[PDB]
């Protein structure tokens, strides 16, 4: 395809399909700026949030709105991991991740200020689209290295091969890249 | 004194005083991870958002939670402009800017997909702390060059210099770094 149509919690959109590798096509989700879809995806996921989760962690800047809206509906705080160290950080813990996009070295970074918020806590990862499990595996290694246990993974979409323990609101198929 | 007290609409916080420059400390405000404080600042600013504003534009990742909450409260859409070009963007428009603290080159980027959301519309720039205005005149010119009209600047705090063309909820001084 060229754009992939999809409807999530009653909100209708047409996701663009773009080349992401050798010649790879995936439908691109962007919640950044989409107040409506953000709030819908969040109200739907909050209902399917295991009550034992105490804290939310998100790796992507695009899912910060979903993580914030999710935090407000559930009352559970949320933590933001970044791709590099930021001047506001304290004694960040970093974990290295290699990409599918370019195969370049990537970092996943946790603010040192957020450790008392992860340590001893049951964590749910929150992402906009959870893919194969390369950055996913690294985020939980990051979280678990500072004291948290990942007990759930939430997203808007699952992608590629259909996992079982993600709480998603839909699944996107892989496409022929044209 | 290692921290600066602050109060927003009944939410009390104590901001760490941390060093940002050669001889300078600032009170650190971070809405990423503070759901309670974000929602408070957004309720207070909605009350003070000039009613002719049709769109909210923010340049910082750190104020994305406030821009989103603000868009939910007021019903007006929100735009996130970035510091580099991103893979989701379509036909991006850019602007040159010299930052402060880094004092090195910065870029300000508006997604082309965001120009219809700004062209011909009355705009509010949204930020978490307006200190310098390195990005304030550069962001305003980027917006006005594609058709937008900047009619307001919103923020939680002004810093150092008490800007007057800003709608803020408080003012933060500079500190001497122990």
Question: Could you give the CA distance from residue B167 to residue B147 in angstroms, rounded to a whole number?
Answer: 23
- Three-state SS at B172: strand
Structure tokens at B2: 């290692």
- What residue ranges define each of the domains in chain B, with the CATH number in brackets? 1-178 (3.40.50.2020)
Instruction: Report the b/e string of B113-125 with b at 16+ CB within 10 A.
Output: bbbebbeebbbbb
Q: Which residues pair with B149 in a beta bridge?
A: B122
Distance from the Cα of residue B174 to its chain's centroid: 18
Way the structure was solved: X-ray
The reported resolution of this PDB entry, expressed in Å, is: 2.6
3-state secondary structure at position B20: coil
What is the C-alpha separation between A50 and A167, in angstroms, rounded?
10
A38, A71, A117 member nearest B35 (Cβ): A71
- Measured between alpha carbons, how far is B134 from A83 in angstroms, rounded to an integer? 24
CA angle, corner A63, sides to A58 and A67, nearest 5? 65
Check A77 against B114: CB less than 8 A apart.
no
* Under 8 Å between Cβ of A175 and A20: no
CA–CA dist B107, B110 (Å, integer): 10
Q: Show Cβ contacts of residue A164 under 8 Å, excluding neighbours closer than 6 positions.
A: none
Find how far residue B26's CA is from the centre of its chain.
Answer: 16
Distance CA B88, CA B83 (A): 14
Residue B166 corresponds to which tokens in the numbers above? Answer: 């800003």
Residues whose CB falls within 8 Å of the CB of residue B58, separated by 6 or more in sequence, listed in order: B64, B66, B67, B78, B79, B80, B81, B125, B126, B127
Q: In terms of DSSP H, where are the helices of chain A?
A: 35-46, 64-74, 135-146
Bridge partner list, B37: none
Q: Tell me which residue of A5, A31, A32, A7 sits closest to A16, measured CA to CA.
A: A5
Q: DSSP label at A175? A: B
Distance CA B151, CA B122 (A): 6
**CB-based contact, B72 to chain A, within 8 Å:** yes
Of B54, B59, B84, B87, nearest in space to B71 by CA? B54
List chain B residues with CB under 8 Å of A88. 18, 28, 30, 62
């Amino acid at each position: 395809m060229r754009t992939y149509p999809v409807e999530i919690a009653g909100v209708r959109r047409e996701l663009p399909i773009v080349q992401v590798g050798p010649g790879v096509a995936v439908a691109l989700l962007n919640l950044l700026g989409d107040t409506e879809l953000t709030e819908a995806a969040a109200e739907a996921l909050a209902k399917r949030l295991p009550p034992e989760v105490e804290v939310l962690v998100t790796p992507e800047v695009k899912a910060v709105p979903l993580a914030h809206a999710l935090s407000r509906i559930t009352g559970k705080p949320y933590v933001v991991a970044r791709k590099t160290e930021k001047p506001y950080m304290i004694n960040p813990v970093s974990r290295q991740v290699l990409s599918i996009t370019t195969g370049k070295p990537q970092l996943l970074v946790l603010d040192g200020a957020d450790i008392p918020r992860v340590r001893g806590k049951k964590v749910a990862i929150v992402d906009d689209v959870v893919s194969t499990g390369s950055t996913l595996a690294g985020l939980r290694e990051l979280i678990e290295s500072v004291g948290g246990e990942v007990v759930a993974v939430l997203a808007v979409f699952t992608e590629g091969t259909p996992r079982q323990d993600v709480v998603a609101l839909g699944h996107l198929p892989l496409f022929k890249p044209e």
